[PDB]
Design a binder for this molecule. Structure first.
Ligand SMILES: *[C@@H]1O[C@H](CO)[C@@H](O[C@@H]2O[C@H](CO)[C@@H](O)[C@H](O)[C@H]2NC(C)=O)[C@H](O)[C@H]1NC(C)=O
Ligand SMILES: *[C@H]1O[C@H](CO)[C@@H](O)[C@H](O)[C@@H]1O
Ligand SMILES: *[C@H]1O[C@H](CO)[C@@H](O)[C@H](O)[C@@H]1O
Ligand SMILES: [Ca+2]
Ligand SMILES: [Ca+2]
Ligand SMILES: [Ca+2]
Ligand SMILES: [Ca+2]
Ligand SMILES: [Ca+2]
Ligand SMILES: [Ca+2]
Length: 311
């Protein structure tokens, strides 16, 4: 017969409804007819005033803990009167308050994306939660302003939100090896409550840079009486890649003359060039040697250089 409503989390003593008034009871009738609550468990949440005859909240009620994700939260109690005895079914509806804030699984989420990632590659994000119902749950997401990733949220047939990152511009570890992005979930409350997640995109290295010498061609001079052991020059090639792909070992061309191979010595590590044999100006007065730096990776890459030695 009787249907009342009360807002969730309301403090004990909050009026739910005037039962006695609705049942046509007044004054002595409340004690003559022995107004009561049923022996059911739902009497733990409510109190029926001996004086007022009004139904009130007995303890702070959490509709999240009661109904969960139900559209409506009904709490049925039973009112008992005597002389004559007659029972009244009372349904109290617990209305949803926007007292829960959007939450993420982890404050910080790491995403390891390869540098070679093609534009348009989609990267699903962990969805946020908000145990409130209606618009009091997660309404929309926002992504902090950046230059490589785009936020995309689509609504499923379920109705739940599914956020994912979209790569707008191609990454480059040699520019920045880390992108920190902030993912914010916001509910549709007024005021709106929120939660964040710090997404640190770790750009994984790709061997897309070949070694490079300081100069394309470098010419040097050498006296005709240069003693063996003297270092002519030190090769300098730089690879901006990381780890193995950035380290290199020097080498001569695959078709360097045997004369230049015996006369000129090199170091596959330092790149320093020493002379071993004799060097007469009458035999030859010019040498072009094909220098070559090669990085340790798969697929490997190599840079090339030509050194002109004048004697
Ligand atoms: C070999 O060449 C590289 C670059 O080609 C040199 O790197 C230097 O790096 C510092 C980094 O702070 C820069 O400020 C310099 O301007 C770079 N130098 C040049 C010439 O570009 C590196 O010094 C060279 N090594 C030798 C032994 O000369
Ligand atoms: C999350 O977002 C809400 C609404 O933008 C803010 O009110 C809150 O302080 C947090 O920034
Ligand atoms: C959003 O902001 C909160 C509070 O500053 C952080 O805990 C979270 O990691 C994200 O940066
Ligand atoms: Ca609650
Ligand atoms: Ca709530
Ligand atoms: Ca909420
Ligand atoms: Ca690159
Ligand atoms: Ca790279
Ligand atoms: Ca390399």
């Amino acid at each position: 017969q009787l249907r009342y409503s009360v807002v969730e989390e309301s403090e004990p003593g909050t009026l739910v409804g005037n039962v006695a008034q609705d049942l046509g009871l007044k004054g002595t009738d409340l004690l003559s007819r022995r107004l009561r609550l049923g022996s059911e468990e739902n009497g733990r949440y409510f109190s029926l005033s001996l004086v007022s005859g009004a139904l009130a909240v007995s303890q702070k009620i959490d509709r999240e803990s009661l109904c969960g994700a139900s559209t409506s939260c009904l709490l049925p109690v039973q009112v008992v009167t005597e002389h004559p005895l007659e029972l009244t079914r009372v349904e109290v509806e617990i209305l949803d308050l926007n007292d829960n804030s959007p939450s993420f699984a982890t404050p910080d989420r790491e995403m390891r994306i390869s540098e070679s990632a093609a534009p348009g590659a989609r990267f699903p994000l962990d969805s946020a939660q908000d145990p409130d119902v209606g618009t009091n749950t997660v309404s929309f997401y926002t992504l902090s302003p950046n230059s490589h990733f785009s936020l995309h949220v689509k609504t499923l047939k379920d109705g739940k939100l599914f956020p994912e990152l979209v790569l707008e511009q191609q990454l480059d570890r040699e520019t920045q090896a880390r992108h920190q992005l902030v993912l914010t979930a916001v509910d549709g409350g007024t005021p709106a409550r929120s939660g964040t997640s710090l997404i640190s995109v770790i750009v994984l290295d790709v061997n897309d840079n070949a070694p490079t010498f300081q100069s394309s061609v470098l010419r040097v001079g050498l006296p005709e009486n240069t003693p063996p052991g003297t270092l002519l020059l030190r090769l300098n090639a730089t690879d901006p890649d990381e780890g193995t792909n950035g380290q290199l070992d020097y080498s001569f061309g695959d078709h360097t003359s045997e004369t230049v191979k015996n006369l000129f010595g090199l170091d596959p590590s330092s790149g320093a060039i020493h002379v071993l044999g004799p060097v007469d100006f009458e035999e030859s007065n010019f040498y072009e040697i094909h220098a070559r730096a090669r990085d340790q990776g798969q697929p490997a890459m190599e840079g090339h250089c030509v050194i002109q030695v004048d004697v």
